[PDB]
Design a protein around this ligand. Structure first.
Ligand code: WW7
Ligand code: CA
Length: 89
């Protein structure tokens, strides 16, 4: 079902969309399809001011990976935001 999630997707316009889509490119500016991993992860967090081990970051991808695949597609991705948004933690 996962409806309670699509409910928020309707709130998202299109201006804030181009903001995220632009991020993916970074996480995968040379990957085949666009599957993100602890590999291209620490790559973006580098521009900020962090650079932990791929073992710790996996924890962030293991929480959303509701299919155990070690990836973050534009799918389960939205969920992440919707969650932290409607409820930060
Ligand atoms: N660590 C996840 C929290 C996301 C932060 C919200 C802002 N989105 S973001 O561009 O900063 C961003 C950060 C970390 C992982 C991402 C993946 Cl796997 C896909 C797309 C964007 C990602
Ligand atoms: Ca996944």
């Amino acid at each position: 079902m996962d409806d309670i999630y699509k409910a928020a997707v309707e709130q998202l316009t299109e201006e804030q969309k181009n903001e995220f889509k632009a991020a993916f490119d970074i996480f995968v500016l040379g990957a085949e399809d666009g599957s993100i991993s602890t590999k291209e992860l620490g790559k973006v967090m580098r521009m900020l001011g962090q650079n932990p081990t791929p073992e710790e970051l996996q924890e962030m991808i293991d929480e959303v990976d509701e299919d155990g695949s070690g990836t973050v597609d534009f799918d389960e991705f939205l969920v992440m935001m919707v969650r932290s948004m409607k409820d930060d933690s």
